[PDB]
RNA sequence: AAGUGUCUAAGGGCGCAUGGUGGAUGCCUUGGCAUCGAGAGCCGAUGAAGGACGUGGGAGGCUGCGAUAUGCCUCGG
RNA sequence: UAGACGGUGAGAGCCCGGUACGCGAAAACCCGGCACCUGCCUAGUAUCAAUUCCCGAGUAGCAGCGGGCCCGUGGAAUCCGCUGUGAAUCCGCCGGGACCACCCGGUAAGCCUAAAUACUCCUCGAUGACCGAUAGCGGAUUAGUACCGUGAGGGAAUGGUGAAAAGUACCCCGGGAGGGGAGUGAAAGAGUACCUGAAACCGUGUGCCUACAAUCCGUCAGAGCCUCCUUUUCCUCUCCGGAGGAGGGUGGUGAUGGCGUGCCUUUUGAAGAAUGAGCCUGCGAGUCAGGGACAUGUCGCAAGGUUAACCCGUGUGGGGUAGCCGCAGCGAAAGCGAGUCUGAAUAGGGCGACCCACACGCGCAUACGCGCGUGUGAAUAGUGGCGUGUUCUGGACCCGAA
RNA sequence: AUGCCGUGGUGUAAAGCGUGGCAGUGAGACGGCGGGGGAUAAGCUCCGUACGUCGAAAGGGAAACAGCCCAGAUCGCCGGC
RNA sequence: CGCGGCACAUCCACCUUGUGGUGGGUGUGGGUAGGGGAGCGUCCCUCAUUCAGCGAAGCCACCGGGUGACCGGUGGUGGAGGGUGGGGGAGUGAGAAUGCAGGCAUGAGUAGCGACAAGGCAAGUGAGAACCUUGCCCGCCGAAAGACCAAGGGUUCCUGG
RNA sequence: GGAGCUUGACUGCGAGACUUACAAGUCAAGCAGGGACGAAAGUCGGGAUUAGUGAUCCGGCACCCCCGAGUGGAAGGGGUG
């Protein structure tokens, strides 16, 4: 019973290549070189989605800091004040507010300033 | 085509009526002047195979 | 029919094909080494160079008698339950009931209370067998 | 005045459309391997096996054939 | 009594060659039968006295050296061979595992002997959970050829048009090959370099990015264009379309930022400046026999189980009881038996038999259980086949030495 | 001082023991702590720890970094501490 | 930690309450050598069934689906053998052995083109001429680059195409 | 250290433990027989302990009816030392 092992292998070849399309040079043409890249690419996606989440926090923080400085207040005391106020609002939508409605951001700043106690002593 | 039994094992080990194999001790065939009767009694008799090589011995006999 | 005919559940274990990738079993597959075992099977006898147990231990004492006529052993308790009515016990009858190897001489053991008063036409009875047979009321033969 | 400011593709990259090279896969077979059963189990100094040379109306080889030469005679199909 | 296969323009019982089945041999050969021919016997069978001879000769046997038989000169028989010596013919001689007395058996050194058994160059008929052109014999084709080698020897590649050649008339470019137009053709997207026609590779057309910018040549964010497309301002031309565009969503491309040291093997340890791979396609590496062994799961039976060789028959079924494992083991062995051995005995010890929520008869006990029997229904198992894993001898996972 | 054996409680999910089947390992490295060999030496070598990590563990930090610090990735999330 | 989706042990209550499963809770789930468990897929025989020249296999592109190996539909090419399920059996899955057979790449339109004897012009055949033919010059070996035999080769000699 | 008498520098066993990969090594109260010292109780299975040793096969001496290749014997083999 000779089986002619071409077909079964071709399923892998055409699948991996059609997914690997777009890669430069001997990456989107060669099965055995493409296969390497899918391994590296997918390990990269695996860690990059998580890093992406952290990255977006970094961006949101920077923008909040910018608007906060426009209202003459730091990010530190901003978050401290909002926590004291119980305003459990995430940094994503807070940074959104910074653009959609800067006045609302100013209002939240006044709330934080009022909620903050007096100084840096305890 | 057909299994062989190790002739030395068949000439040194004795299977009992159950799943046990015993070993003859005889470190007493060369010099017997310095050995006390205590030692020769330790060697006299027949001793069950220690469980540390039965998985090998049973295949050597069979 | 054949299209409803199925194997028994738990039987027909699939053959673990060995050298078919890392997810199936492995590249080295059992022989995960580079020494002798990787390339060939060492005789089970060889221990390493030191004297194996086959020469280390002393030769089993004694010999074997060539002229040893081994007798088949008949359980008197089996006689008790097999022939509760007694009457007569022949060797052909006992082998007809399958209690002893065919075409062989026999002996009688006494391990078992004998109540059947029956004479036994056979060979080589033990003294305790005579005690039990005469207890029942029978007679020993040879 | 000072500043913002698209547009170049010599020639490369990626992806589509369409061709070429190659003859893999699929399907097949003028062909082979391994077996059961049944025969024969020898040829040859009457010149064996196997070959060179040659033979056809038409160049060469294979199969057949031997100065009677891709054939002759006889009994049958 | 034909539905086996194959072919015919596609999957045919009824189209065809055939099959089932029945016929069929002048002549030759083989076999068998018949007749002729050839060839053996004018008995030694039986009862008996046992005077005499005979029953295979440089043989047997012995000794020495060797072979081989499980038998490695060893206590070494039987058998064979060589070398020296060297007997007897029934009150004999040799063998029955050194050897000797007794006992049973057969009469050597002379010849022949079919069947049962093994094998297949070759020739029949059939089969196939065998191959389908890098497989099968190396050889499907000018194959043991071309070719290599002083030579012995070594030893390739090349299959497929189409149902039918109907192998593209004729015309036009071109020296021709080649191509286009016509035409046959179901189809030329089947044209001799040809069924199907992938990839590497080459190249063209075109959407998009790129000439101040370094990073296994990716991933994730991610603007702007391109293409597809929904709603919609809007064109009112509306029985049409949706043009261009905002917004939304696919498929490409991707400015620019972040992150990030090829794969395999071997290594204490690798991105590698350790090795290996130019790429693509195809080929290829833990498998099998055996009434093997060990263990395990399922399936037959149930103190049994099971048949091998072999016979019958038509598919692989029915028979076949020789044998195997189990059933009682211990001991060097004799041997005896739930005991057995060492041992004066075992008081002890090696090995194996015997587990109750409990009644009845019975001794002991405050209660609780020791023991002989039946159960208040109390405690249990091997064997064979098919699988799985391992293992043994078999080339033994494959390739590779000098 | 720790550590070891055993014992009575508390606590704990599997960790242990015995008997079987089938393999691997049988070349270790570094750091911390005690040593010895050495030169008061070494990214040297040889020992012990129920001391750890790598080996066989990605991630964050040490600028870069198998062995140091924190921490043991089932998968997803444009959510937090 | 939170919010959802898979899985493995143990446990709670159930359906054939250790064969086998349903709802829920807790804990667990990095992993090479290695053990174990459960599967996909190519080919082939058989049984049931069945699409199929109103177009299968194979191949190509697209859109979808599955935790994964992988699968389906549509359209195109092609033009005759494949699907589903229960079973059986493997010459069964290649990314690597300085692997093999075949084809094509990079190197690259790079090197090299073969004694340090030398070619040139005209006319002409011819679609096309440095290289062929016929003339005129030049040059070279000339004890060899000349002229005859042997071995060897086996028609390579001449004509015509 | 010293003195008198002696030979347990024994026989057949030894539960149960340590130790250890295995082989191997090591200790063992107590019991039967028989004996020594001891008026007795009691000690004694070599040396205050640890070093003074060498697996298997084969061969040799003595002993034990264990077998005895048809039987009875023997060769030879087997068991104990």
PDB file of N, CA, C and O (backbone and C1' of nucleotides) in Angstrom, chain D residues 48-54 62-66, chain E residues 144:
ATOM      1  P     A D  48      24.763 -28.088 -32.005  1.00  0.00           P
ATOM      2  O5'   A D  48      24.035 -28.044 -30.600  1.00  0.00           O
ATOM      3  C5'   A D  48      22.850 -28.793 -30.387  1.00  0.00           C
ATOM      4  C4'   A D  48      22.402 -28.706 -28.953  1.00  0.00           C
ATOM      5  C3'   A D  48      22.371 -27.299 -28.377  1.00  0.00           C
ATOM      6  O3'   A D  48      21.123 -26.671 -28.580  1.00  0.00           O
ATOM      7  C1'   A D  48      23.680 -28.673 -26.989  1.00  0.00           C
ATOM      8  P     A D  49      21.039 -25.129 -29.003  1.00  0.00           P
ATOM      9  O5'   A D  49      21.290 -24.392 -27.622  1.00  0.00           O
ATOM     10  C5'   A D  49      20.489 -24.702 -26.498  1.00  0.00           C
ATOM     11  C4'   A D  49      21.096 -24.168 -25.232  1.00  0.00           C
ATOM     12  C3'   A D  49      21.415 -22.687 -25.262  1.00  0.00           C
ATOM     13  O3'   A D  49      20.280 -21.909 -24.931  1.00  0.00           O
ATOM     14  C1'   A D  49      23.274 -23.892 -24.414  1.00  0.00           C
ATOM     15  P     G D  50      19.711 -20.823 -25.965  1.00  0.00           P
ATOM     16  O5'   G D  50      20.908 -19.794 -26.113  1.00  0.00           O
ATOM     17  C5'   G D  50      21.551 -19.295 -24.958  1.00  0.00           C
ATOM     18  C4'   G D  50      22.924 -18.768 -25.268  1.00  0.00           C
ATOM     19  C3'   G D  50      23.010 -17.770 -26.401  1.00  0.00           C
ATOM     20  O3'   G D  50      22.590 -16.474 -26.015  1.00  0.00           O
ATOM     21  C1'   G D  50      24.724 -19.364 -26.644  1.00  0.00           C
ATOM     22  P     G D  51      22.343 -15.359 -27.136  1.00  0.00           P
ATOM     23  O5'   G D  51      23.813 -15.102 -27.663  1.00  0.00           O
ATOM     24  C5'   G D  51      24.046 -14.534 -28.931  1.00  0.00           C
ATOM     25  C4'   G D  51      25.492 -14.678 -29.306  1.00  0.00           C
ATOM     26  C3'   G D  51      25.864 -14.234 -30.707  1.00  0.00           C
ATOM     27  O3'   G D  51      26.070 -12.835 -30.790  1.00  0.00           O
ATOM     28  C1'   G D  51      26.721 -16.380 -30.335  1.00  0.00           C
ATOM     29  P     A D  52      25.547 -11.993 -32.054  1.00  0.00           P
ATOM     30  O5'   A D  52      26.733 -12.128 -33.106  1.00  0.00           O
ATOM     31  C5'   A D  52      28.005 -11.581 -32.805  1.00  0.00           C
ATOM     32  C4'   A D  52      29.041 -11.950 -33.839  1.00  0.00           C
ATOM     33  C3'   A D  52      28.692 -11.631 -35.283  1.00  0.00           C
ATOM     34  O3'   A D  52      28.974 -10.287 -35.617  1.00  0.00           O
ATOM     35  C1'   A D  52      29.492 -13.841 -35.145  1.00  0.00           C
ATOM     36  P     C D  53      27.988  -9.466 -36.574  1.00  0.00           P
ATOM     37  O5'   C D  53      28.087 -10.235 -37.963  1.00  0.00           O
ATOM     38  C5'   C D  53      29.294 -10.224 -38.706  1.00  0.00           C
ATOM     39  C4'   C D  53      29.232 -11.138 -39.904  1.00  0.00           C
ATOM     40  C3'   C D  53      28.031 -10.953 -40.812  1.00  0.00           C
ATOM     41  O3'   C D  53      28.194  -9.888 -41.723  1.00  0.00           O
ATOM     42  C1'   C D  53      28.303 -13.242 -40.355  1.00  0.00           C
ATOM     43  P     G D  54      26.936  -8.989 -42.135  1.00  0.00           P
ATOM     44  O5'   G D  54      26.023  -9.992 -42.967  1.00  0.00           O
ATOM     45  C5'   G D  54      26.478 -10.530 -44.197  1.00  0.00           C
ATOM     46  C4'   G D  54      25.575 -11.636 -44.692  1.00  0.00           C
ATOM     47  C3'   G D  54      24.128 -11.257 -44.951  1.00  0.00           C
ATOM     48  O3'   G D  54      23.945 -10.647 -46.218  1.00  0.00           O
ATOM     49  C1'   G D  54      24.220 -13.291 -43.743  1.00  0.00           C
ATOM     50  P     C D  62      19.746  -7.219 -33.853  1.00  0.00           P
ATOM     51  O5'   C D  62      18.291  -7.236 -33.206  1.00  0.00           O
ATOM     52  C5'   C D  62      18.082  -6.800 -31.872  1.00  0.00           C
ATOM     53  C4'   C D  62      16.633  -6.922 -31.468  1.00  0.00           C
ATOM     54  C3'   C D  62      16.014  -8.298 -31.628  1.00  0.00           C
ATOM     55  O3'   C D  62      16.368  -9.205 -30.607  1.00  0.00           O
ATOM     56  C1'   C D  62      14.530  -6.678 -32.453  1.00  0.00           C
ATOM     57  P     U D  63      16.653 -10.739 -30.978  1.00  0.00           P
ATOM     58  O5'   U D  63      15.229 -11.302 -31.422  1.00  0.00           O
ATOM     59  C5'   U D  63      14.194 -11.449 -30.466  1.00  0.00           C
ATOM     60  C4'   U D  63      12.905 -11.958 -31.068  1.00  0.00           C
ATOM     61  C3'   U D  63      13.010 -13.173 -31.977  1.00  0.00           C
ATOM     62  O3'   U D  63      13.126 -14.396 -31.275  1.00  0.00           O
ATOM     63  C1'   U D  63      11.663 -11.560 -33.016  1.00  0.00           C
ATOM     64  P     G D  64      14.168 -15.519 -31.765  1.00  0.00           P
ATOM     65  O5'   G D  64      13.547 -16.050 -33.133  1.00  0.00           O
ATOM     66  C5'   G D  64      12.255 -16.635 -33.159  1.00  0.00           C
ATOM     67  C4'   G D  64      11.775 -16.874 -34.570  1.00  0.00           C
ATOM     68  C3'   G D  64      12.678 -17.712 -35.469  1.00  0.00           C
ATOM     69  O3'   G D  64      12.563 -19.110 -35.263  1.00  0.00           O
ATOM     70  C1'   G D  64      12.070 -15.774 -36.618  1.00  0.00           C
ATOM     71  P     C D  65      13.859 -20.052 -35.406  1.00  0.00           P
ATOM     72  O5'   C D  65      14.355 -19.819 -36.899  1.00  0.00           O
ATOM     73  C5'   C D  65      13.572 -20.256 -37.996  1.00  0.00           C
ATOM     74  C4'   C D  65      14.129 -19.790 -39.318  1.00  0.00           C
ATOM     75  C3'   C D  65      15.500 -20.311 -39.696  1.00  0.00           C
ATOM     76  O3'   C D  65      15.467 -21.643 -40.189  1.00  0.00           O
ATOM     77  C1'   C D  65      15.420 -18.000 -40.092  1.00  0.00           C
ATOM     78  P     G D  66      16.709 -22.646 -39.968  1.00  0.00           P
ATOM     79  O5'   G D  66      17.817 -22.157 -41.004  1.00  0.00           O
ATOM     80  C5'   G D  66      17.519 -22.084 -42.392  1.00  0.00           C
ATOM     81  C4'   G D  66      18.735 -21.773 -43.229  1.00  0.00           C
ATOM     82  C3'   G D  66      19.869 -22.779 -43.135  1.00  0.00           C
ATOM     83  O3'   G D  66      20.567 -22.888 -44.376  1.00  0.00           O
ATOM     84  C1'   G D  66      20.636 -20.693 -42.382  1.00  0.00           C
TER      85        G D  66
ATOM     86  P     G E 144      18.537  -7.117 -22.626  1.00  0.00           P
ATOM     87  O5'   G E 144      19.503  -7.915 -21.646  1.00  0.00           O
ATOM     88  C5'   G E 144      20.909  -7.907 -21.837  1.00  0.00           C
ATOM     89  C4'   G E 144      21.537  -6.631 -21.348  1.00  0.00           C
ATOM     90  C3'   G E 144      23.061  -6.662 -21.237  1.00  0.00           C
ATOM     91  O3'   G E 144      23.611  -5.381 -21.534  1.00  0.00           O
ATOM     92  C1'   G E 144      22.165  -6.162 -19.161  1.00  0.00           C
TER      93        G E 144
END
